[PDB]
Amino acid sequence: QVQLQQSGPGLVKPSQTLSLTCAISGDSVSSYNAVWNWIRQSPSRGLEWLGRTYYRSGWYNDYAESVKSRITINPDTSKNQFSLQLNSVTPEDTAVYYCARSGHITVFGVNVDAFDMWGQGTMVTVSSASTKGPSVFPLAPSSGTAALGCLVKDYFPEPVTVSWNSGALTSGVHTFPAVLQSSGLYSLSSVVTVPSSSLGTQTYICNVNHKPSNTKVDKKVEP
Amino acid sequence: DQICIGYHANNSTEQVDTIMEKNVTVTHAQDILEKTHNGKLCDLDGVKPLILRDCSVAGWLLGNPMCDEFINVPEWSYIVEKANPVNDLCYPGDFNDYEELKHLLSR
Amino acid sequence: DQICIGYHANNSTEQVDTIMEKNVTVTHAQDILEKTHNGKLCDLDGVKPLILRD
Amino acid sequence: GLFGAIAGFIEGGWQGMVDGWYGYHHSNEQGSGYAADKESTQKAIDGVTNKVNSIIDKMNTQFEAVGREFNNLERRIENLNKKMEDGFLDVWTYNAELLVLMENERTLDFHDSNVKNLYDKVRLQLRDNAKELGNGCFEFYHKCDNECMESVRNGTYDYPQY
Amino acid sequence: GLFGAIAGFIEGGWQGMVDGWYGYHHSNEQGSGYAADKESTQKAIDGVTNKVNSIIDKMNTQFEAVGREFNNLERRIENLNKKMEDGFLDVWTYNAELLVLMENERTLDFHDSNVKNLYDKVRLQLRDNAKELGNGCFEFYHKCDNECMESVRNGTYDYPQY
Amino acid sequence: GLFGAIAGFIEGGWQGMVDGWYGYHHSNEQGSGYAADKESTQKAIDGVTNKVNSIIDKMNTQFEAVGREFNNLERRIENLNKKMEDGFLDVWTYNAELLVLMENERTLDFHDSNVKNLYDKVRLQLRDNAKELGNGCFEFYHKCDNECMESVRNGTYDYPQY
Amino acid sequence: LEYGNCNTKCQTPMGAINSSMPFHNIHPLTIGECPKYVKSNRLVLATGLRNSP
Amino acid sequence: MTQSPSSLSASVGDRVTITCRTSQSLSSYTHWYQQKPGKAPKLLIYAASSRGSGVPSRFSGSGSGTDFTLTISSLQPEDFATYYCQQSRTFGQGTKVEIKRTVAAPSVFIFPPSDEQLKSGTASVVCLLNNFYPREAKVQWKVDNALQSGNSQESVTEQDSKDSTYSLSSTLTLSKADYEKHKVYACEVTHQGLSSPVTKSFNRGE
Ligand SMILES: *[C@H]1O[C@H](CO)[C@@H](O[C@@H]2O[C@H](CO)[C@@H](O)[C@H](O)[C@H]2NC(C)=O)[C@H](O)[C@H]1NC(C)=O
Ligand SMILES: *[C@H]1O[C@H](CO)[C@@H](O[C@@H]2O[C@H](CO)[C@@H](O)[C@H](O)[C@H]2NC(C)=O)[C@H](O)[C@H]1NC(C)=O
Ligand SMILES: *[C@@H]1O[C@H](CO)[C@@H](O)[C@H](O)[C@H]1NC(C)=O
Ligand SMILES: *[C@@H]1O[C@H](CO)[C@@H](O)[C@H](O)[C@H]1NC(C)=O
Ligand SMILES: *[C@@H]1O[C@H](CO)[C@@H](O)[C@H](O)[C@H]1NC(C)=O
Ligand SMILES: *[C@H]1O[C@H](CO)[C@@H](O)[C@H](O)[C@H]1NC(C)=O
């Protein structure tokens, strides 16, 4: 199996440069049966192909007309990766960026641009605002089913991830989409319904990760 | 300023034959002949065959004492018999219309 | 003033097959397969058959 | 099609040309109309006719099955007989169906070829006395009356005259 | 090849055009690059696909051998049986190998044709607004920016405009 | 022919070109004559040679009849034997005759193609330095001496020089 | 089947054939001046050319 | 690339068909992707009708001229997703497929602000509506029996991949001083699964 592992910061100031990397394993950046693409997605614009690089007895790049003057996609054959560089960003460049392989599947040896494998995505926010880690508060069960949760308040930028009991508790979990508050900071809640009987014996801890601020916090939630 | 017309090439070494030319290198080809096998006798769609081993169809059906393995065989998919099974008619003789019966077995 | 080169078309819906394309509509076609029969036993060139019946 | 004329640089056929398979449409001060190129047409009719007869006639000698019956203890040869007769039918069914497919493809391409050659025939007469429009048509630099048009269809178009 | 384009007046293919079988390479003041002609390409994919399936499917009904055994005084029919089964195998082996050879030749020529027609398609649009260099390329007399280039690939190249 | 050259825009062949299948006839102030295009010619010879050997060799494995005799009360299997042997002979007779017909058509068209391509090869070199007369001939605007003529046959005709 | 009170140049066990076609698909066992039997459902030769929309 | 419809609801087991009309008809270059919330798209169908790696047989694709169709022969709860078609470098706008199941009323829970948060100078009060269908739900805040306006935000989950329900949070935010000024905090919920509005409340301090 091929895996694509993305990295790079999810916060870029307006007018500056967005820089992402896709690290390949299980295939070669310079393979004759691969094409390496960047695609972005935003709630407004939908899915948009940005560009690609590929090797066929020499390196080639193609870029979307919309970004052509600002975009560079370069292979690294030392580290088996390829990059995205997007200059002079504006709020309209806020999106989830995906790397993806195409041309692995071909009709009669012709790349059809079908994208068989994708990276996990990097959410990129274009903003002058600065990083802020969340405060985490318990949503305590009161008084056969009990609900408990964690309020993850006042962070920037997106995203936050929440698990429970280090991922050992998944059933009945609901982690809500974030809302942007009038302060310009995000907030969400996560949570979980459990048997009320288990409150006297089972420990419940929410594990909160905000990678842009390097925040990893664990909060015990009790009656 | 110019515009040019052209066609695909790649690193392919696949070759095909034509009437007028043999070993033409093409960009893509499709093999349509299976050349390999696993070298084994197998269950056909899960249903095991009857493998008579050293017994013949006669030895089996008449109940040659050396062919007790096949005293009551379950349903089979196909039957396997050696070229010269040693346990045939223990007491020498003939089997009348043997071939016509073996044909009947194929149904 | 101009002169143009072109070809025939008509209201035909006859179709033929080729190796590379199936159901090609053509202007004209010729069926070469007899599909029908009269469903009866008949005299062959006048000369009547022997019908053994039961 | 292989030759690029039919449903190619000539976008579609003409309902209005009833009298032949290929031909000319002219347009000048006197009027306009269709005229079939009979020779190119009759050539095509001879080729297709010969083809059909060649096909029919090649399938003339072919396997004819006969009825043979066998008793209850002649199953092996009965099976042999059946496999034999079916085998030949499948072979001749394949030959017939494949021949029709292969020759249908060649028949459609043949027409395409005849159109392409007719177009080139005219092009090679007119040379630089007309604009090749790129859609099957030639626009003249000089006036071309009905006799002028006819000389194009003739093969007689006097190039030095214009 | 029969049509003179592939490995003919177009000397070689392009490693750099990955996205289709046939297409365009443009070169102007803004830059240069490859673009596949998808329609000509998809036409080719449909034809070749139908061909393969036509080949596979025509060989669908074909002789299947069955095991039949015979005693020591049935040598004649045993020989008959063997000659019969071998005979059909040789026939179907011939049919298969010959069909593949014949249709391989036609497949290579088909591609050649599609390239030639694409070249002519462009030639017939540009006419005398460009120099036919003789190697697959057309050099424009006017500047042809990216929208100008796209209109050539379109079929929309406005000739009177230049 | 499919390609329009042989017995098309080139009206007839040349008794006077003995040394090859396709070639050139030149005419200038120094004189005139025929010259065979050997490469195009040798290409044709290799293709046709391979074809013949391919035909001969494909018919290598084919049904061989054996003598088998039957008594007065074995009429059924005697008939079977006869129908079997005749059946295969008719099949192989069909295969042979049809292969010859099909490949003869392709051989004639192949030559037509080679001529058309040789004509275009020259056209694509000369471009607008000569008048395309429409009959296989190109009339030069400049004087073209024997070295000039040879460069046309070469592939070396220096277009910018004229 | 029984007698049809009928005349033909080509007979099959399913019925008679009155046709100038070179092929048929009625039944393999025939007698008389018959077309050649094939297993096809359809055999149609192009004579004309590709018709336009 | 134009997809139709832009969204639909269908019951488990229903046959579902989505269409994509394409500017140019190429069977080989059209693909379908399925994207579940928070995940990357996964290739579902390629070249109009080939099933992508790991794709179950209930998914199939067809193409005719410029019209392409994706069919789910028997809709499952886990097929909640947005489906996109694609030719070349162009994507359609997507079709949201929602499951259609029976009505289910929310379970309602109210949470006071933690003592810890109050020390920061702000108070967040959370009302949870759990596992309901359909999505339409109204939540009103009352503080000492006074309707609040403009001081709450709602967030809703996507449809659950097992039971096809939604959950919803409403969060009322006050300054600590304002929170401490009042006693009764109440969350009032209207949903067509309920016979009449449900109210959950607490008293500050209790
Ligand atoms: C084919 O190409 C022409 C020229 O590229 C297209 O017309 C342009 O379309 C773009 C995008 O829609 C517009 O921004 C321009 O204003 C148009 N300019 C001109 C000069 O036409 C046309 O849309 C294309 N048509 C197709 C592919 O059918
Ligand atoms: C083809 O012919 C041209 C012209 O005859 C050749 O070019 C000449 O070659 C000779 C002998 O090599 C030189 O002495 C001349 O100076 C060249 N003159 C010109 C005008 O080209 C060319 O070498 C030949 N190419 C072949 C046989 O491939
Ligand atoms: C074609 O290739 C095969 C194997 O690569 C080789 O054995 C054979 O000699 C070649 N045939 C010709 C005609 O060159
Ligand atoms: C061809 O036409 C027939 C009847 O119009 C139809 O049933 C069949 O599906 C078509 N075949 C193909 C391969 O499109
Ligand atoms: C056979 O067909 C011909 C032509 O259609 C017709 O004239 C004749 O009546 C038919 N003969 C019989 C015996 O049905
Ligand atoms: C063809 O037409 C021209 C002009 O109408 C006429 O003068 C000439 O005699 C004709 N030539 C033919 C039929 O060859």
For chain E, what is the HEC assignment? CCCCCECCCECCCECCCCCCCEEEEEEECCEEEEEECHHHHHHHHHHHHHHHHHHHHHCCCCCCCCCCCCCCCCHHHHHHHHHHHHHHHHHHHHHHHHHHHHHHHHHHHHHHHHHHHHHHHHHHHHCCCEEECCCCEEEECCCCCHHHHHHHHHCCCCCCCC
G45 and D104 Cβ atoms separated by less than 8 Å:
yes
Helices (H), D2-139: 38-58, 75-126
Query: Would you say the CB of residue E156 lies under 6 angstroms from ligand 1?
Result: yes
A147 and A192 Cβ atoms separated by less than 8 Å:
yes
Q: Is the dihedral angle over the CA atoms E5, E6, E11, E14 positive or is it negative? A: positive
User: Residue E59 burial (CB < 10 Å; 0-12/13-18/19+)?
Assistant: middle
Ligand number with the minimum distance to the CA of D154: 6
D21-48: b (≥16 Cβ within 10 Å) or e: bbbbbbbbeeeeebbbbeebbeebeeeb
In the DSSP assignment, the letter for residue B47 is B
- Residues A123 and A137 grouped into a single domain: no
Can you give the CATH number for the domain in which H52 is found? Answer: 2.60.40.10
Q: Is the dihedral angle over the CA atoms A78, A84, A87, A90 positive or is it negative? A: negative
Q: What's the rounded Cα separation, in Å, for the pair C3 and D137? A: 6
The amino acid sitting at D42 is Q
Q: What is the largest distance, in Å, between two alpha-carbon atoms of chain D?
A: 91
- Residues A19 and A41 grouped into a single domain: yes
Cβ within 8 Å, pair B10-A108? no
- Residues A205 and A217 grouped into a single domain: yes
The amino acid sitting at F131 is K
Structure tokens at H187: 């969350």
Question: Helix (H, G, I), strand (E, B), or coil: what is residue D104?
Answer: helix
How many Cα atoms sit within 13 Å of D61 on the Cβ side? 13
Q: Is the dihedral angle over the CA atoms G7, G12, G16, G21 positive or is it negative? A: negative
Q: What's the rounded Cα separation, in Å, for the pair D144 and D152? A: 10
The amino acid sitting at A189 is S
- Whether chain F has a CB inside 8 Å of the CB on E8: the answer is yes
- Residues H17 and H94 grouped into a single domain: yes
Structural domain of A186: 129-222
Question: Helix (H, G, I), strand (E, B), or coil: what is residue D122?
Answer: helix
- Residues H113 and H123 grouped into a single domain: yes
- Whether chain E has a CB inside 8 Å of the CB on C5: the answer is no
Contacts of F19 (CB under 8 A, 6+ apart): F34, F35, F36
H157-191: b (≥16 Cβ within 10 Å) or e: bbbbeeebbbbbbbbbbbeeeebeeeeebbbbbeb
Structural domain of D72: 1-162
DSSP per-residue string spanning chain A: --EEEEES-SEE-TTS-EEEEEEEESS-TT-TT-EEEEEEEETTTEEEEEEEEEESSSEEEEE-TTTTTTEE--EETTTTEEEEEE-S--GGG-EEEEEEEESSSEETTEE---EEEE---EEEEE-S---BPPEEEEE-----EEE-EEEEEEEBSS--EEEEGGGTB-TT--BPPPEE-TTS-EEEEE--EEEGGGGGT---EEEEEEGGGTEEEEEE---
Q: What's the rounded Cα separation, in Å, for the pair E14 and E17? A: 6
Q: Calculate the CA D85 to chain-centre distance.
A: 37
Other CB atoms within a 10 A radius of the CB of residue B65 amount to 8
Query: Is the bond into A159 cis (omega within 30 degrees of 0)?
Result: yes
F136 and F22 Cβ atoms separated by less than 8 Å:
no
- The β-bridge partners of H21 are H2, H67
Q: Please state the domain count of chain H.
A: 2
D63 and F90 Cβ atoms separated by less than 8 Å:
yes
Subunits that touch chain E (at least 3 Cβ pairs < 8 angstroms)?
A, B, C, D, F, H
Q: What's the rounded Cα separation, in Å, for the pair D85 and G39? A: 12
Determination technique for this entry: X-ray
List, as own/partner pairs, every contact residues G20-24 make where C-beta atoms lie below 8 angstroms and the sequence separation is at least 24, other chains included: G21/C31, G21/C32, G21/C33, G21/C34, G22/C32, G22/D55, G22/D56, G22/D59, G23/C32, G23/C33, G23/C34, G23/D59, G23/D96, G24/C33, G24/C34, G24/C35
Q: Quick one: which of A176, A193, A12 has its CA closest to A90? A: A12
Q: Please state the domain count of chain F.
A: 1
Q: Quick one: which of H67, H33, H68 has its CA closest to H51? A: H33
Q: What's the rounded Cα separation, in Å, for the pair A98 and A40? A: 6
Torsion of CA B67, B69, B75, B79, to 10 degrees: -50
Ligand number with the minimum distance to the CA of F149: 2
H27 and H48 Cβ atoms separated by less than 8 Å:
yes
Q: What's the rounded Cα separation, in Å, for the pair F136 and F11? A: 8
Q: CA-based angle H126:H128:H130, to the nearest 5?
A: 170
Q: What's the rounded Cα separation, in Å, for the pair F109 and F105? A: 6
Q: CA-based angle H162:H163:H164, to the nearest 5?
A: 100
Contacts of D49 (CB under 8 A, 6+ apart): none
The amino acid sitting at E162 is Y
Q: What's the rounded Cα separation, in Å, for the pair D113 and A191? A: 74
Nearest CA in chain A to B9: A56
Cα separation values, A35 from A117, H21, H79, Å: 11, 26, 29
A134 and H124 Cβ atoms separated by less than 8 Å:
no
Structure tokens at F67: 């003598």
Q: Quick one: which of A123, A178, A124 has its CA closest to A153? A: A178
> E strands within H22-115?
30-35, 42-46, 50-51, 59-64, 67-72, 81-87, 90-91, 95-100, 107-111
Q: What's the rounded Cα separation, in Å, for the pair D88 and E88? A: 9
Q: Please state the domain count of chain A.
A: 2
- Residues A6 and A113 grouped into a single domain: yes
Structure tokens at B51: 């493998």
Q: Which residues of G touch D107 (CB under 8 A)?
A: 45-47
Looking up tokens 């769609």 gives B45
- The β-bridge partners of A95 are A124
Q: Considering A75, A104, A128, which residue would you say is the last residue of a domain?
A: A128
> E strands within H144-190?
146-147, 152-156, 166-175, 184-190
A3 and A25 Cβ atoms separated by less than 8 Å:
yes
Can you give the CATH number for the domain in which D35 is found? Answer: 3.90.20.10
- Residues H188 and H109 grouped into a single domain: yes
Structure tokens at H185: 């905090």
Query: Would you say the CB of residue G7 lies under 6 angstroms from ligand 5?
Result: yes
The amino acid sitting at F48 is V
- The β-bridge partners of F15 are none
Q: For residue E120, which phi and psi values (nearest 5 degrees)?
A: -65, -40
- Residues A137 and A106 grouped into a single domain: no
Q: What's the rounded Cα separation, in Å, for the pair F94 and A82? A: 61
Please, what is the end-to-end C-alpha distance for chain D in angstroms?
35
Q: What's the rounded Cα separation, in Å, for the pair F100 and F103? A: 5
Q: Calculate the CA B62 to chain-centre distance.
A: 28
Q: Which residues of E touch B16 (CB under 8 A)?
A: 104
Decide the pairing of beta strands A122-126 and A11-12: parallel
Atom 18 in ligand 2: which residue has the minimum CA distance?
A: F147
Looking up tokens 């003598």 gives F67
Contacts of G21 (CB under 8 A, 6+ apart): C31, C32, C33, C34, G35
Q: Calculate the CA D100 to chain-centre distance.
A: 14
Ligand number with the minimum distance to the CA of B21: 3
* Inter-helix orientation angle E75-126/D75-126, to 10°: 20
Q: What's the rounded Cα separation, in Å, for the pair C44 and A2? A: 74
Cα separation values, F31 from A154, F25, F162, Å: 97, 11, 21
F80 and D67 Cβ atoms separated by less than 8 Å:
no
Q: CA-based angle G53:H1:H4, to the nearest 5?
A: 95
Q: For residue E93, which phi and psi values (nearest 5 degrees)?
A: -65, -45
In the reported structure, the alpha carbon of residue D6 is separated from the centroid of ligand 6 by a whole-number distance in angstroms of: 28
Structure tokens at B36: 């390999």
Contacts of F124 (CB under 8 A, 6+ apart): E9, E132, E134, E135
Which bin fits F127, alpha (ψ -120 to 50), beta or left (φ > 0)? left
Can you give the CATH number for the domain in which A123 is found? Answer: 2.60.40.10
In the DSSP assignment, the letter for residue C44 is E
Cα separation values, D46 from C9, C31, F103, Å: 20, 19, 20
Q: Considering A128, A163, A192, which residue would you say is the last residue of a domain?
A: A128
Contacts of G22 (CB under 8 A, 6+ apart): C32, D55, D56, D59, G35, G36
Task: Give residues after which chain C gaps, C-N over 2.5 angstroms.
Answer: none
A137 and A160 Cβ atoms separated by less than 8 Å:
no
Q: What's the rounded Cα separation, in Å, for the pair F58 and B20? A: 13
What is the enclosing helix (H) or strand (E) of D61? none
Q: Quick one: which of H79, H201, H74, H189 has its CA closest to H132? A: H189
Please, what is the end-to-end C-alpha distance for chain F in angstroms?
35
In the DSSP assignment, the letter for residue F19 is S
Structural domain of H129: 101-204
Torsion of CA F31, F37, F38, F43, to 10 degrees: -170
Cβ within 8 Å, pair C29-G45? yes
Q: What's the rounded Cα separation, in Å, for the pair C9 and E40? A: 24
Question: Helix (H, G, I), strand (E, B), or coil: what is residue D102?
Answer: helix
Asked whether at least 3 C-beta pairs link E and H within 8 Å, the reply is: yes
- Whether chain D has a CB inside 8 Å of the CB on G28: the answer is yes
User: Residue E4 burial (CB < 10 Å; 0-12/13-18/19+)?
Assistant: buried
Cα separation values, H98 from F34, H7, H10, H107, Å: 80, 8, 7, 22
Q: Is the dihedral angle over the CA atoms F11, F12, F18, F22 positive or is it negative? A: positive
Q: Is the dihedral angle over the CA atoms D94, D100, D106, D108 positive or is it negative? A: negative
Query: Is the bond into H5 cis (omega within 30 degrees of 0)?
Result: yes
Q: For residue D19, which phi and psi values (nearest 5 degrees)?
A: -95, 0
How many Cα atoms sit within 13 Å of G11 on the Cβ side? 19
Q: Quick one: which of D123, F113, F121 has its CA closest to E127? A: D123
Decide the pairing of beta strands G10-12 and C24-25: unpaired
Cβ within 8 Å, pair D4-E116? yes
Structure tokens at F49: 């040679």
Q: What's the rounded Cα separation, in Å, for the pair D20 and D38? A: 6
Decide the pairing of beta strands G23-24 and C33-34: parallel
Q: How many CB pairs under 8 A join D and F?
A: 56
B17 and E101 Cβ atoms separated by less than 8 Å:
yes
**Number of the ligand 3 atom closest to the C-alpha atom of B23:** 1
Looking up tokens 């088909």 gives E110
Resolution attained, angstroms:
3.7
Looking up tokens 């229903």 gives H14
- Residues H7 and H96 grouped into a single domain: yes
Query: Is the bond into A157 cis (omega within 30 degrees of 0)?
Result: yes
Q: What's the rounded Cα separation, in Å, for the pair B92 and B103? A: 23
Query: Is the bond into H134 cis (omega within 30 degrees of 0)?
Result: yes
3 state SS for A62-89 = EECCCCCCCEECCEECCCCEEEEEECCC
> E strands within chain F?
23-28, 31-36, 130-132, 138-140
